[PDB]
Amino acid sequence: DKKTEETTLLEDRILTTRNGHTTSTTQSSVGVTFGYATAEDSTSGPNTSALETRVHQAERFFKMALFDWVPSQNFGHMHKVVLPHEPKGVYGGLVKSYAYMRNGWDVEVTAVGNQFNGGCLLVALVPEMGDISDREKYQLTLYPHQFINPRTNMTAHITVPYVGVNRYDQYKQHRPWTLVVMVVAPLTTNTAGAQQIKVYANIAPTNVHVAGELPSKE
């Protein structure tokens, strides 16, 4: 990404993302990391007797908070979460009405502090993540990732495809994606840094497909 004017003292490398009727501009991008592929496998498998459908409405942004990064938490301090987690709105509604479904993720994690802070976070997405050892936090870079480092950027953006041993899942009891964020360099505050950093996420379920309409009481 890039911006004009000339050079300046502030930020540039502008980038606007858009899913559904929701946008997200960022004058401090560092690009966007792409998953394990550029396009998902065939969305219409035999396992769905082709009764599957796709919902454009679900593919929109939704926000959810992560944690507060403070100088206390040092190396290896990590905050993980499995997507979807508690899902609301349209997207959420799908889960209650369809037996099976699938979708990838458009994740934009934003740790807004200020350029005088030191320190650095590592944000990644992991398939079937089941508790890492202390040692293997060092090899976390094997996953779709992106760093946030105050001197450089505010936002990390990673887009990722749906994965799994099954073409379609039952989110109600298996989700493959687990969004994690870990401290690699403890937060520096110096003279004019920000006391602490609030970390949020802007997410969008991508290419959502559902199959097997369930019964209903309401």
Binding site: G31, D131, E136, F147, V165, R167
Partner: protein
Amino acid sequence: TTTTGESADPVTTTVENYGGETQVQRRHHTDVAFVLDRFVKVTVSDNQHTLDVMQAHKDNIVGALLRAATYYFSDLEIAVTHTGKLTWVPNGAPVSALNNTTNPTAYHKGPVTRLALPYTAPHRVLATAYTGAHLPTSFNFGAVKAETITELLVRMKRAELYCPRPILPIQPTGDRHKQPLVAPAKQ
């Protein structure tokens, strides 16, 4: 070679930067299909045993390397040192089948008995991990049963791996991990 580090986009410099000259490689040995294509002992405890590749030792080349991926596909080859009739049964078969002989049953011919078996799960691929821990019933290659099963080995054929997972060595005590390496007799 300065880069925007945050990007996460791969960077690979070369000795050419200072005047050197990058050479050739033959990473045949570090080829997936190849490394995993060998036998590995699996600890059998009864006289009947479900075939599962996750049972290789986690520090054994094959098991270590298999676990260095999250999803995998492959056909199997097995080498069993057993007694009496060895019977195999396909993934999802009622355990009671192991006793029936009209199933692929091989008579004895010692020492070992070697077979080639087809990937037989009902998923497009299987997994090393899983978050939906303890792996699902269906992640197997069938089961085997023989009056006596002294030893069991398996070999992965046609291996395919997806999404890399970490793989750690030994944590050295001092500055490096020194040890005894194959050397000639002193004389």
